[PDB]
Assembly symmetry: C4
Homo-oligomer: 504 residues x 4
């Protein structure tokens, strides 16, 4: 369109002429860093302009402005500034309107959309912004109720940061698809960090240490019940009149109850999140395993009741998975909570792509060796020779594992070539790649600790809504500001402490 | 010569005197950064000068200018500029001539020669250069047909970049001897990157995924036919009246057909490229293996037909090589395509030089131990004691593998010294060197992926010339410029999209 | 309070008005970088101010000033300067008073408190500060008695650095709780480094090399006495009339004497330091082991005398610990003294947190496998299957270690999964973490050598107080200054040499 | 002294007064950067000064000036400059004198002393210094006989660099004690690098590749003669009338001849160099081994002739050493010549200090285990249990290697503790340290290749003095300058080529 083409052309004379006589006009002008035109467009003698009018697509002026943010320091400063002048102009025209509280058709606030998009700068500013002109401090968030000097206590609005019945600032930062570029560090901002720390130290630390204790108890019960399973006859085994048998039956029913509980808590999670298959493992990997080691026990139950003795095969895998899943509860520790994150990454990246490169070698040399052997031990089987070759990779093989071969030069050449390629070369580069992975996710991922605490804190908070949803509310309904209408702004503020020396 | 000695001496008065009354005069003056003398030499009252006249060696003014480029940022800016003024002067004198289209006696254009030489700066500029003076935009390549604003769409000439019946911009960048210093990154330039990406996404992705599927099918057929080979009697085995035997014969003929196909596709490649022996492996290492694992099967065929049972020795090596060669088809993946490049480098550098350092130790201590042993088991053999010592290097040896030694202090001292030197010291430094190699070619070689896609794309494009050579042509014959003669410049342009904010 | 609120508000007019008509007034003003107010507050026409008056909490002006230091280069310069002007003002008012010699109620001097707090800048300046105004050089420490030119010899006060009957500058830097941030490098300052070097080279090198020799002799005696222990009957073994038996009895009594000596030297240390349990191992780890390997021998003695043959179990652990504790005496070497510090850190950090992550896997798969096995070898025991699984982690296991399993697919799947998770993945990331640890404490911890020499030098100095406490005093009682009272300042100075060229 | 104290005090008025009415006066003034005083002191109306007068200690003005150089960029510039003005002043006073040719009482020239001391800057300047004032170009070294332009050919004096019958510039840089700080890179200077390269490419490459071939032939002869040694009876074995026996006797006499040759070439080297014991291995480690593997064969000969059959023990070690010493001849290759330097460093630093830390553990746990075992196999021996424990460190041990122990908890606890401490912890930190060592001497030591070529080139040049000492002289006796006396300076110059563009 020409009327917007001229605006995008940085033309002021034509803009004024059109006034006399982002796809929206205001949004299109704003996104181009004209700035002064925004004020000129906002009000004009020929006709005024309105920002409250939402776009057909659903993005208002604020949504459009945050849309263009591309996480650049200069870009961050520009966008946050121009956002501030847009808010100031809106206040000047009519302070009654609440632009930020206004939302798109999809129910996303500018703060929530900034969080989901991953715009760290805009979210950081909006979360904490202090206005000094008292007549214009209504729409400020980071206050300074009292600064004694060395310490300058501050108050943060935290309206939709915690108590929000919609997508909140933390929910989006911890329950999203995890493709956002800076979710890892984006919750180190001023209010969120201390809010989550307070939540944990006050209300969630016990409810988590309790869950770990109950899980350990459940796993001990399950191990004891599985270890002492009857071995005579076919299931179901009729109860016997012994204290041990009844006590074991209690253990078994506890095991099955836990299994069904985990199955349902997994199914409800997968209906709540609807994770994409391509991102099924990357995002929620600690949630797939708790579901699978309950699927195993459900299969075990159905096999056990249907006159079958293969249920042990299922139950044993469930037991091993249940024990090895106690690394999900190390997220509550910084020092030891990074080992559960190294295994997760190495099993999915370093050990998943490297298996294709290895099974090729193993199968090639296995077929070679097995065809070389006449069989005229029973080593002619492909499985047996594929297992004898695997032992070489873990340093407990034996060169002379067969003699049915007619040719001794060729067989030993093949075996030595395999040993050199896999034991000495492939292993020593897989280990090198694991070195790089450990480097990375031990030097930069030291705050996946914080991210995992955010996820578990939100999970527990959602869990205990029935117990205390409104009561378990962070922050105090304190008075820090006054509205233009004359009412007192009672905001759910969160006290904060900070110190600075050089400023004096 | 004095007339050129004065020019090389930065003398202007003597140059003017000589005018009144790089080995070429114009080229010699140009290479010295006189610049103004180039204009002065080009035309003069006493007599004019011509640039179209090719030198006796074969380098014109443009070839000579690109010759001196030494890949320096300041040098790159200087050479590209002075190249631009040479083109402008040539246009001013007579726009009819086409200097760049002009070539040397060897058929190399300035762009092609710049590509082969490895001059990244000159090639980058010439590939994309935009002229703003409309009267002088004839010899421009990177146009801006329309810039809407945030997006500024561009057009690239791409005359000899793809559809060239001569050494093209991509052919030289992907089918050369690979001694060029920046071939790895040199195809990240504006037009080439997106041209190759479009070629792959449109026309080559299927033709490659088809080849990998057919190779997997061929290898499965070959493995099945080799695994179920008859073991009774001597070859050739007469066909039996069984479904299995006939089906196996079909498999065998497919195997031999594939073998001969690979043999011929290797021989034709080695006659097409004529690779130097010193660079036989460095450049085309994935091409030697496909040839060798076909030589093995041809040897197997000739042995099989000539009443011989050692053909199994050849066929087994062919089978193992064929299976392990499926890492050639991982070039089409970024994540897993770097494991095929780590093996290639480590087998040729880290594991080839380190074997000399190890066979010395193995042979020294083997001879020592074998002479120490009287034999008064049959361990006196040099092979047996060289194998017993090798097991120590891969952690499955045994100290007391013999007792024929008269001296127990000396034999155990030798064995412990060998174990400490090879198992604990040589292995743990070979692994460290592999660490450095993996570091390098996992941090910088992440675009050998792109380079290998360039090679395979060119290979497939040459393969399907009969199917669609002219039809499978990239770019559209679009109108972006006008020649001085008045004809419309219909150029095989390639649309491109780009965005910039700060410029405004 | 308002009178101090105004001061903290950087108000000068109100300060002057209050004068006319850190919690202390002077300290509160000083900590805020008013500086000029300190001089104004010190003396005033309306009323003067005194700094000698100690605060109720116990911090004087100097203690308060050093309290605010936060180890910042600009902060260090500011605090050291303002400290210097406070000293100068105190001298001007009345040079008779000795502020620095003055101490708090807890017996801490400003230097000692600066050392304990970890303030490197303040301690570095106070230790070496040179005054050029001769009338004001009384309270200087780093003198220049004579500077020949290229060499400028210097004298350092070293009053409480060595000969202090209180918490001294070295004692605090080497016998504290080790939570101080820069104790590692904080004793590289001018006087302390050369003082400790002189102490070692003169008086302590022999007394330490003697102790190592005596410990080696004691361990050889103990090993010989334990190796040739009687094996017939039950203890106590009655002495026999043989030279060997009597000589062994002498060895045994020497062993027990050494054991009781170590027990008491450990108990007295733990009553001297009162280390917190949370820091029991981090701080004094080389002191726990010498105590434990004496507790073992005391338990061995009490078992031996009370008609018991399990004393061998205790004595053997004591012997192994005593031999492996000879790495405590490698602190006296730079090159080999870093291996005793790598083991200390890796056993407490890399191998302590990683065991939890491993015992989970071992126990999970052990329970899985043992429940899978019917036992219908005696491998049903949990211990046997937990040991068979452990061998896999150290590369000497065997896949087919049992056959009592009914299901062969499941058992081998479990075994291969365990081998891949623990042998190939957990080990290769524990080794990577050990790589980072070794990197760190081999590149930065190369002065834990110096720190350990400081600790051992102080230990030996305290040990030999009875031999020569006053006589073994560092520095000479030399004359470098004169007091205002007219007496000659005979200070225990330590000569030092230094060279500078550029200053000229 | 006062007359020099004033000079060291930067006093000019007192210096002038003393004139009217480094320990030497001129040297003392020069070393202090007075500069102008040097000219003032050199000549004065009251009395002149002379620089040719050598000091009592033996350092002249030039030696004293180079003495103070401390390898600092600003210091290097200052010292080289002031050296140049001293030379210019000496020329002005009387060009007849040759100060640089003048030497101290010990026979060291300023260039030679600068080389030995390790002063890179002074040596670099003196080796190549160009003077432009033609009247003052006599004492210049780096000439420019003709500069065509892009290429500026240069001539270098190289008087004592190669043909010097005294300590030369290369001899000192390659046959010194190796404690010099920058010997590694100090021979990358302009003339030395190309001089050594020319020497190798022309005269030494063959004489070295010949020596390696002859050594390989000698080792093959020795291996063949030792492998087929008679086994019947006692030595000396009387010759038998067989072709094989006579041919073996020829091999044996060749072996002994080579052994005695190596013994004498080692003894003469150790009398030529007189290496200090503390630096016996650091400096010449490739020279100790060739001597030791000849001592072994001499011991073998003396045992063989004196009716003894233990000569095999000596000869076998000699054979193993001779084979493993072929890594001395990899210095002539860049790519593979760094493996012989990694072994040299790791055997002396990483594996020598780490053995003390390991033998402590091995002996402690060996004594513990052996005393724990009653023996009521023959595992009670200390050697057997020390070997069974060592196998654990190289991953081929066995937990249940004995059953004579009464206590099974304690024995297995000890074994597991040993395995965890040594196999899993000590090995994985020794490997980490080897990682650092390989990092270093593979990233910075890539020119120990050049240094070793320098040493071998000098060795071969000294070897072939009888063949062609004067004839095998580098450089041409060319004319580049003229002396003040009028004679033509025919200097043994070495042509050199260089190119520069930016200077123009
Ligand atoms: Na093994
Ligand atoms: Na191993």
């Amino acid at each position: 369109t020409a009327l917007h083409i001229a605006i995008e052309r940085r033309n002021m004379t034509l803009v004024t002429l059109l006034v006399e006589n982002g796809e929206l006009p205001l949004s299109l002008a704003a996104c181009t860093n004209q700035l002064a035109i925004v004020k000129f467009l906002l009000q004009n003698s020929w006709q005024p302009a309105d920002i409250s009018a939402r776009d057909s697509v659903g993005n208002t002026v604020l949504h459009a402005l945050v849309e263009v943010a591309d996480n650049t320091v200069d870009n961050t400063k520009f966008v946050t500034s121009m956002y501030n002048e847009i808010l100031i102009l809106g206040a000047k025209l009519h302070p009654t309107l609440k632009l930020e509280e206004i939302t798109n058709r999809k129910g996303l606030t500018p703060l929530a959309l900034a969080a989901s998009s991953g715009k760290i700068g805009v979210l950081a500013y909006i979360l904490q912004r202090e206005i000094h002109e008292p007549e214009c401090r209504h729409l400020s968030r980071k206050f300074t109720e009292w600064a004694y000097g060395p310490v300058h206590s501050s108050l943060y609005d935290l309206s939709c940061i915690d108590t929000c019945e919609k997508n909140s600032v933390l929910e989006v930062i911890a329950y999203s698809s995890s493709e956002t570029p800076n979710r890892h560090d984006m919750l180190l901002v001023e209010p969120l960090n201390r809010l989550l720390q307070d939540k944990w130290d006050r209300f969630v630390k016990r409810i988590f240490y309790f869950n770990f204790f109950v899980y350990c108890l459940y796993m001990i019960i399950f191990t004891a019940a599985a270890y002492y399973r009857p071995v005579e006859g076919l299931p179901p085994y009729k109860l016997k009149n012994t204290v041990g048998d009844y006590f074991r039956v209690t253990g078994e029913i506890l095991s099955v109850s836990g299994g069904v509980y985990f199955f349902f808590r997994g199914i409800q999670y997968f209906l709540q999140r609807r994770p994409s298959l391509k991102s099924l493992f990357v995002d929620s990997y600690s949630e797939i395993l708790f579901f699978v080691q309950s699927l195993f026990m459900l299969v075990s139950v159905v096999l056990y009741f249907s006159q079958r003795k293969e249920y042990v095969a299922s139950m044993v895998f469930s037991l091993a998975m249940g024990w090895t899943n106690m690394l999900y509860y190390t997220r509550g520790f910084q020092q030891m909570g990074i080992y559960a994150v190294m295994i997760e990454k190495m099993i999915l990246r370093d050990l998943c792509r490297f298996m294709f490169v290895y099974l090729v070698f193993l199968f090639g040399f296995s077929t070679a060796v097995v065809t070389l052997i006449e069989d005229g031990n029973s080593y002619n089987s492909l499985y047996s020779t594929c297992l004898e070759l695997f032992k070489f990779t873990i340093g407990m093989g034996d060169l002379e594992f067969t003699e049915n071969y007619d040719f001794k030069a060729v067989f030993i050449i093949l075996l030595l070539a395999y040993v050199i390629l896999t034991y000495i070369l492939l292993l020593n580069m897989l280990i090198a790649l694991m070195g790089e992975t450990v480097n990375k996710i031990a030097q930069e991922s030291k705050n996946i600790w914080k991210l995992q605490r955010a996820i578990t804190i939100l999970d527990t908070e959602k869990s205990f809504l029935k117990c205390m949803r409104k009561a378990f509310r962070s922050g105090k309904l304190l008075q820090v500001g006054f509205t233009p209408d004359g009412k007192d702004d009672y905001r759910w503020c969160f006290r904060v402490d900070e110190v600075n020396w050089t400023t004096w």
